[PDB]
Amino acid sequence: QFTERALTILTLAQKLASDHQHPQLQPIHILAAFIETPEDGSVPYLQNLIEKGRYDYDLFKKVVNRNLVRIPQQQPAPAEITPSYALGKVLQDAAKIQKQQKDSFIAQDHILFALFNDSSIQQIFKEAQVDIEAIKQQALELRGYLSKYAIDMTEQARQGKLDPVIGREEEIRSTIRVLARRIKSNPCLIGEPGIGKTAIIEGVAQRIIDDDVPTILQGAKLFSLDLAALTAGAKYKGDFEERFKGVLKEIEESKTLIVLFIDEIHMLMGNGKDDAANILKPALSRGQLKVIGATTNNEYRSIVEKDGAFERRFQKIEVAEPSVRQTVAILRGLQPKYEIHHGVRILDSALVTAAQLAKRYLPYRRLPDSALDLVDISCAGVAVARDSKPEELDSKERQLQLIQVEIKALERDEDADSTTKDRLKLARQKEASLQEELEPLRQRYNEEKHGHEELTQAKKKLDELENKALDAERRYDTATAADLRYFAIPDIKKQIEKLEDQVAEEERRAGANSMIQNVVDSDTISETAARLTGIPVKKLSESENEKLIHMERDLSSEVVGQMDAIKAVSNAVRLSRSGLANPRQPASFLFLGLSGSGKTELAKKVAGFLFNDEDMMIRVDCSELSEKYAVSKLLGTTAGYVGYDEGGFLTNQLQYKPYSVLLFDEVEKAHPDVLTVMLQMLDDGRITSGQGKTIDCSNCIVIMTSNLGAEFINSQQGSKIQESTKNLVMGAVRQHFRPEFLNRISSIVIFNKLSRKAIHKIVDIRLKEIEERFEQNDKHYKLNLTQEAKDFLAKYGYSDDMGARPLNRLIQNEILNKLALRILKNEIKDKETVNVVLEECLEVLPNHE
């Protein structure tokens, strides 16, 4: 079919044959059809591909008019009996040209290409155009180089390959509102990268296409001017200015109220620069050039700090992150796209779960991207598995080849006639069994694959019908809108439903099919999340009974005594993983006590327990504090400063390990310099670093620790600290920290004197671990602590003022020192005996062998 421009030329050619009473419509008339006027700025006459291509128009009009005179007349009714072979071919070739250029309709431009292929003027010395070489270049020389350096967003949005962007309607309308401004008329989208800023623009393109804009903008058009525009479409010094003040100049006039945009967005800080004004200001001032800009939060600040003129030319727009609900709605709209992408079924609950998980395990990553990546990655994953089902197929194929080896090893011989090798027949029988089992597995699997291919295509076809329906609706093309809405779409819809039923669900499983090829809400998605990030905080691992429910016992086992603290912890972690801890606040505690009490041991054991890794913990030296409080703290240094470790000791670790237990050392030594930062983590954990990037602390439990309370706790008035003493501690804590800081801590916890009844068990744990960690048991002890070593250790070391620490020392002082001596003296070959003789008395083994 033809465009309005092309159809006009066709129509005019026919008109001219009738007007001149000619029996045949010839290229001469179509050439005449182009030269409607003698206008210098008209593409049909002097901005024409022919003029710029090869033959001059003063000469052209002479050629055309000479032929119009030479072509014979009729008595009007017989005009145009034929179009000649020539226009038949040219007009159809113009369709061929569409196909070469991948255009939807025949352009007048295409008719000119068709004419170049067939342009020949009868004469002894015939006139002609170059077959096509010049015109391909001349097409670029029409306003169209815009398409060389830019994507016509409205053309593409109208054509297809554009997602149903939703949840951005507020922002789309706001962007349009800015375009409706008179001074700051160039909206700018600001936020996280990857947030749908382009999607907003695309949404605007759709509204322009639909004419759902405030009248003035109905005459508008959107283009993405980039990449090629920036650099790739050129190679010489000065080419920038030439393509810039070329494509922009073309854009600036006549061809609709063109609005441009950048996809590399921050790029204006390099694509503007010397031309920061020239890129727009005078193009807007002289007419209608408008743009939709964009930048990240950090880049926004940079373009402002660098220039700032952009705040006179542009209007800053914040772009939101969607809620899980909104994210899911987005995923649902695109769910069939994803199913088509991989030929995989996707559960609705997988979109919900992926969105919930993405926020829970990667809170600092864009939610809709992360949710999607989790899905597209897992979709891709199962699609890969389904290529071979190797567990059955590779296993049998290997067994078959192993048989082939046995076959040649036994067959290609003289001993082949002896039972020595003729035993081979047994392997051949096995070969046959494997071939017979394998082929139906193979074909069954191919059938399962085909079912997915059928679904893929059925869904694809439906969407194409929809794309077409949407264009028909905006054209108010009732006829094709009806062709699609009635019967065609319902047909494919029903085919899809039938194809889904072809899965042949049976009571034994969701399909007669042996393979899954689906995205299961938790199994597929939770697994993928774990494979991608290690720790799946919302996995809800089966063993909850120990993992949080009986955490008190696990903590009691690792941390003996301090039952009050353990119970305080147990309540805390249950709130953090049950989801009850309100999302507005990471759980946080202050651990107060005496040295050797185990207060940091408990926190480490919490990390141990929750992540199965005590090294999951991130430590903060809150006592090493001065005005430098940057790279070593939760803020980092700031972009523009020398060095790239912008929180290189913490902020990067917090994102690296998205959640953990963050623990601060002796916070009593801390100052507001960082306490007012820790505060930003204590609740509403969104600390923005000097990178412009945010920690977004959520799941992470934050522990503050201190011996501040020792001032009263060390009264030792019972191992269990009593009210009074605790209030004095509380008082002192409030003296040290802003009480409001403290009020954002979930609870302040006071540790007890580590009781001797606890220590009496702790030392066994320690001694066991001490020995086990000493490389290999090529030495070590038999470790018969008996009643006596345990009691010596107690009587000579369970100090009320050092807890477990003096025991570490005692053990070394006695137990390991004597061992070392027995080792050095070659009294031990392996292991060693343990006892006390009155006075620790490590015994000695028979001399080393």
Ligand X SMILES: Nc1ncnc2c1ncn2[C@@H]1O[C@H](COP(=O)(O)OP(=O)(O)OP(O)(O)=S)[C@@H](O)[C@H]1O
DSSP 8-state code for residue 266: G
For residue 600, say whether it is annotated as part of any ligand binding site: yes
Give the interface segment with ligand X, choosing from 129-137, 215-223, 625-633, 799-807 (CB under 6 A). 799-807
Instruction: Among 17, 115, 172, 176, indicate the residue that binds a second copy (CB under 8 A).
Output: 176
Which residues have C-beta within 8 Å of that of residue 130, sequence separation ≥ 6?
A: 53, 54, 116
For residue 480, say whether it is annotated as part of any ligand binding site: no
| Minimum CB–partner distance for residue 713 and ligand X (Å) | 12
Say if CB 226 and CB 150 are below 8 A apart.
yes
Give the interface segment with ligand X, choosing from 96-104, 215-223, 538-546, 596-604 (CB under 6 A). 596-604
Instruction: Among 416, 423, 486, 553, indicate the residue that binds a second copy (CB under 8 A).
Output: 486
Please state whether beta strands 220-225 and 150-152 pair in parallel, antiparallel, or not at all (unpaired): antiparallel
In the region spanning residues 758 to 797, those forming contacts with ligand X, defined by CB under 6 A, are 758, 762, 766
Contact between 198 and ligand X (CB under 6 A)? yes
Cα dist from 246 to 145, 253, 442, whole Å: 8, 11, 59
The count of C-alpha atoms lying within 13 angstroms of the C-alpha of 505, restricted to the half-sphere facing its C-beta, is 5
Contact between 321 and ligand X (CB under 6 A)? no
Which one, 332 or 574, has the nearer CB to a second copy?
574
Per-residue contact string for residues 145-174; x = within reach of ligand X by CB under 6 A: ------------------x-xxxx------
Per-residue contact string for residues 407-436; x = within reach of a second copy by CB under 8 A: xxxx-x------------------------
d(CA 76, CA 438): 78
Residue 144 is inside which H or E element, if any? none
Contact between 496 and a second copy (CB under 8 A)? no
Contact between 160 and a second copy (CB under 8 A)? no
Query: Where do breaks (C to N over 2.5 Å) occur in the chain, by preceding residue number?
Result: 144, 838
Residue with tokens 């390959």: 161
| Minimum CB–partner distance for residue 71 and ligand X (Å) | 54
Say if CB 677 and CB 660 are below 8 A apart.
no
For residue 284, say whether it is annotated as part of any ligand binding site: no
Please state whether beta strands 220-225 and 257-261 pair in parallel, antiparallel, or not at all (unpaired): parallel
Say if CB 265 and CB 299 are below 8 A apart.
yes
For residue 597, say whether it is annotated as part of any ligand binding site: yes
Count of CB atoms within 10 A of residue 314's CB?
23
- Which tokens sit at 204? 């605007």
Which one, 659 or 758, has the nearer CB to a second copy?
659
Which one, 72 or 164, has the nearer CB to ligand X?
164
Give the interface segment with a second copy, choosing from 92-100, 268-276, 499-507, 516-524 (CB under 8 A). 268-276
Contact between 183 and a second copy (CB under 8 A)? yes
For residue 381, say whether it is annotated as part of any ligand binding site: no
- Which tokens sit at 67? 């032929």
d(CA 129, CA 714): 102
| Minimum CB–partner distance for residue 117 and a second copy (Å) | 20
Contact between 302 and a second copy (CB under 8 A)? no
Which one, 327 or 755, has the nearer CB to a second copy?
327
d(CA 456, CA 519): 15
DSSP 73-122: P--STTS-SB-HHHHHHHHHHHHHHHHHHT-SSB-HHHHHHHHHHH-EE-
Which one, 34 or 664, has the nearer CB to ligand X?
664
As beta bridge partners, residue 423 has: none
As beta bridge partners, residue 204 has: none
| Minimum CB–partner distance for residue 122 and a second copy (Å) | 17
d(CA 423, CA 543): 52
Which one, 263 or 454, has the nearer CB to ligand X?
263
Count of CB atoms within 10 A of residue 524's CB?
24
Give the interface segment with ligand X, choosing from 126-134, 581-589, 688-696, 798-806 (CB under 6 A). 798-806
DSSP 8-state code for residue 145: -
Instruction: Among 561, 586, 608, 685, indicate the residue that binds ligand X (CB under 6 A).
Output: 561
Contact between 330 and ligand X (CB under 6 A)? yes
Q: Which amino acid is at 769?
A: E
Which one, 184 or 756, has the nearer CB to a second copy?
184
Instruction: Among 583, 715, 730, 829, indicate the residue that binds a second copy (CB under 8 A).
Output: 583
Instruction: Among 284, 728, 823, 844, indicate the residue that binds a second copy (CB under 8 A).
Output: 823
Say if CB 829 and CB 848 are below 8 A apart.
yes
In the region spanning residues 361 to 400, those forming contacts with ligand X, defined by CB under 6 A, are 368-369, 372
Instruction: Among 66, 249, 425, 738, indicate the residue that binds a second copy (CB under 8 A).
Output: 738
Contact between 600 and ligand X (CB under 6 A)? yes
In the region spanning residues 362 to 381, those forming contacts with a second copy, defined by CB under 8 A, are 372-373, 376-377, 380-381
User: How long is the chain?
Assistant: 849
For residue 192, say whether it is annotated as part of any ligand binding site: yes
Percent of the chain that is helix, strand, coil (3-state, to 5): 55, 10, 35
Contact between 59 and a second copy (CB under 8 A)? yes
DSSP 8-state code for residue 416: G
Contact between 139 and ligand X (CB under 6 A)? no
| Minimum CB–partner distance for residue 421 and a second copy (Å) | 10
d(CA 692, CA 297): 7
Instruction: Among 86, 195, 568, 620, indicate the residue that binds ligand X (CB under 6 A).
Output: 195
Say if CB 583 and CB 700 are below 8 A apart.
no
Which one, 189 or 631, has the nearer CB to ligand X?
189
Contact between 476 and a second copy (CB under 8 A)? yes
Give the interface segment with a second copy, choosing from 95-103, 505-513, 794-802, 822-830 (CB under 8 A). 822-830
- Which tokens sit at 48? 């024409």
Contact between 641 and a second copy (CB under 8 A)? no
Instruction: Among 559, 700, 704, 749, indicate the residue that binds ligand X (CB under 6 A).
Output: 559
Residue with tokens 């774990």: 530
| Minimum CB–partner distance for residue 151 and a second copy (Å) | 8
E strand spans, 415-481: none
DSSP 8-state code for residue 606: H
Residue by residue, what is the 3-state secondary structure of 337-369?
HHHHHHCCEECHHHHHHHHHHHHHHCCCCCHHH
As beta bridge partners, residue 71 has: none
Residues at the binding site for ATP are: 191-198, 593-600
Q: Given the rule CB under 6 A, which residues bind ligand X?
A: 163, 165-168, 193-199, 263, 265, 308-309, 311-312, 330, 368-369, 372, 559-562, 595-601, 754, 758, 762, 766, 802-805
